[PDB]
Design a protein around this ligand. Sequence first.
Ligand SMILES: OC[C@@H]1[C@@H](O)[C@H](O)[C@@H](O)CN1CCc1ccc(CCNc2cc(Cl)cc(-c3cccnn3)c2)cc1
Length: 765
Amino acid sequence: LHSEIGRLNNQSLLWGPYRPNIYFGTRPRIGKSLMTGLMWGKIESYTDFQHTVRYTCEQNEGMKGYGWDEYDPRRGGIQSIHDIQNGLDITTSFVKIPGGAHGGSWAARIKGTLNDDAPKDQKTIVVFYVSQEGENSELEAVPSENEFGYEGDVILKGRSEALGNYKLVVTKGKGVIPQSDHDLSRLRGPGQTVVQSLTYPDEVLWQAKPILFQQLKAGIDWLVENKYDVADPPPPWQVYLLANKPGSGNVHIVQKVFEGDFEFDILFSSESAGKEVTSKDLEREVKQATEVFGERFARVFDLKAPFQGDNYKKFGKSMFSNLIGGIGYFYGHSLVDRSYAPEYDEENEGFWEDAAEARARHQEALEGPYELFTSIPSRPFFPRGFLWDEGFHLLPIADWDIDLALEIIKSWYNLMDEDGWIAREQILGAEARSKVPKEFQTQYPHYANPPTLFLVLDNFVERLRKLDETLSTASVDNPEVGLEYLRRLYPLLRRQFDWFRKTQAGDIKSYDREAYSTKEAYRWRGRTVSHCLTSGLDDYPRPQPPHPGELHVDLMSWVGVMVKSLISIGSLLGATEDVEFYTKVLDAIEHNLDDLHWSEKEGCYCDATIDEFEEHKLVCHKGYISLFPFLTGLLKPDSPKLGKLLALIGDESELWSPYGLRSLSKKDEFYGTAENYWRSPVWININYLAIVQLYNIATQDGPYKETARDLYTRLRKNIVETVYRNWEETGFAWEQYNPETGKGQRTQHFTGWTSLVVKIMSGHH
Ligand SMILES: OC[C@@H]1[C@@H](O)[C@H](O)[C@@H](O)CN1CCc1ccc(CCNc2cc(Cl)cc(-c3cccnn3)c2)cc1
C-alpha cells in the first residue's frame, strides 16, 4: 500500500511549471526530458528586441511585478506578469489533466494585454521554445500546408522512453498578425507563425536565448547577403521573423508576431491517455482548478482576527501561492571540494587563513548528477534549494499538502552523502550555475546549515499521532504509510545527527571548562573574521577573533531540536536502544546550554570563546542568537530563564520594534554596522519561531502564560501588518524589514520564508 501511494504520488506530481528560474516554462521531474519556455518582447526598432526580450526572471525598474495568483502543483495555477518595459500585462494559466501511464497531460494559456501607456499598435514578438534531451527520443514539427509558415496551429509530435508518445500543439491564437507589403514577403511570406527545428548537443539545449539569437542573426545575415538594405529595409518585426523551416530535432522554436492584444494555447497530449487535450478542456480545467484552490485555502488557511477580512485573504493567497509556486525540479552536476584538506578541521588559532589556503588549491570538481525537487527563496536572484530555508518553506506547504512536503523532504535527503552531509546550497547543472559566480559555486562537506527540515518532520509526527484531495493527505490518513516513510528516512535522519556531532564538535576537554557533560558542545565550521555563513545568520556578531574554542548556542539548540525529533521518531519505530541514547543526549544538552551558554549577568544565552589567558569567556550580543533555546522550544514553560528571555523579547529598548523583533539589540555595539544583514533588521523566519513559542507558552498553565499571551498577540499583529503593508504598497514580499521605518529592504520576490505570514495569520498552532 505504501508502494501504491508512492506511484500515485509520482504520477500526480510528474508535470509542472517546474522552471521557477524563468518567467514561464514546463518540465517533468526527469533529468533528461522535454522542456518548454516562453519568451516575449516588444519590437520598435532594428536593435531593441535583444534588449526587450524576456526569458529568465529578474527584478528592476522595467518590471512592475509578477507572481502566482493561485497555484497547486497537482492541478496547476495562474500567474500574472506586469511588464513596464514591454507595456504588457501577461497571464499564464497552466493546468494538468490526469490520464494514461506517463504522468498525464497539461495545457497552458498565454494571454498578453497591452497596458494604457503602450502604443495601441505595438508589435510584440512571442516565442515558444521546446527542447528535448535524451539519446533514443524524437520530436518533429509537422510541416505547414502553406508556403512560408503556419496559418493555423503548430503540431509537434514526439516520443521518448520516459513520456511514451505525445503531441504538443501551439494553437493559432487570437490577435492581429501584422502584414508586410515589402518585397521580402515574396520570399518570407507577409507575416505568419513560423517554426525552426534544430539540433544542438543535449547539454546546451537550456541556452534558449543564445540559440534563438543565433537563428535571428543568421536571418539578418541572409537579408544582408540577398540585398535587403537601408535604401529600402523591411519593417523591424519582419527582419526579426525567422524563416520557417520545421522538421526533426531536439530544439523547436515557435515564433509569432502580434499587433495589439494577443493570446494562444499550448496543449500537451499524452498519447497513453484518452483523447487529445483541447482548448475547451483547458478553459474548463482552469475554472475547476480555481474553484478547488478557493475551497482548500479557506479550510487550510483560515485567517483569524484581526486578519479575517478580504484584503488579508488576497494577501494570504498571494504570499502562499508565490511560495508553493516557486517549486522547481533541478538536475545536473554540482561543484564540490572533495579534498577534505586538514586545514578545514579548523583546529588552530587563525584557522580561517589556513582554510583560505586550502581553497586556493582549487581541488573542487564536478560530481553527480543529482536531482532536487524543492521550493526556493527567490525566483529573480537565487532560484535554487537552500537547506535551512526549506524547513521554513515547507511549514505552510505541509499544511496545504503533507504528501507534497514529504516528497520534498525525501528529495533533499536523497542528496545526502555517505558521511551524512547535504550541501547547504544546491546548484545543479549548467543552467543553475549560470546564476552564480564561479567563486560562490563550490560546496564544502564540512559546511552545515540549520536542520530546520526536522521542524516539518515534527509537524508530520504530531499530525500522524492525532483523488488529488486524497493523495494530499494519504501519508497521515494511512498511518501504515506514514510509518514506512519514517522507517525509510530515519537512518538518514540519524546519519545527519551523527554527522553534526562528528564534524561540528566544540572543545570542552582541552580547556579550563566545567559542565555537566563532557560531550555536548558545538562550533559551526566555516566562520571567517566577519561572517558565519553556515549558521544562516550571515553577519550576526560572533566572538572576535574566531577561535577553535568557540561554542555557538544556536548550533547546540539545533542539535537539541534534532534529538527531540529523533526521540519521537525512534519511539514510533520502536528503536529502543537509540531512544535511550537520545534521551541522555537531550538531558546533557539541557544542562550544558546552562553551564556553557547562560549569562546570569546579562539575563540571556551567549555564544562562548576562549580568552587570551585560555579561559572560557561568554560573548554576549543581545539578539536572535541570545534567544535560541527558547526559539527552538527547548526550555520548560516555568523556566526562570525563559521569563528573562521574555523580558528581553518584550523590551522596546533592546529587541522589540513596532515592526517585529530586531535581529540585534539597539544597545549592541554592532547594531546597524557593516553590511547590517543580521545586525538590526526584522527577519520573518526567526520572528515566526518566536511567535510559535509565545503561543505555546500562552496556551498552557504557567507563570508566564499571560506575558506570553500579550507578546504573542502583538508580535503576530506587528509581523503580519508589516509584511502586509509593504505588500500592499510595493506588490512584494521582501527578505527583511527595517525596524525604524517598517520598509521592506534587500531583495524582493522573497517567497521565501517571508510567506510564513500565511501560517502566522492562520494561528491555532
Ligand atoms: O534565503 C537564502 C539565504 C539564507 O539561507 C541565508 O541565511 C541568508 O543569509 C541569505 N539568503 C539569501 C542568500 C543570498 C543573498 C544574496 C545573493 C546575491 C543576489 N544577487 C543579486 C543580483 C542582482 Cl542583479 C540584484 C540583487 C539585489 C537587488 C535588490 C536588492 N538587493 N539585491 C542581488 C545570493 C544569495
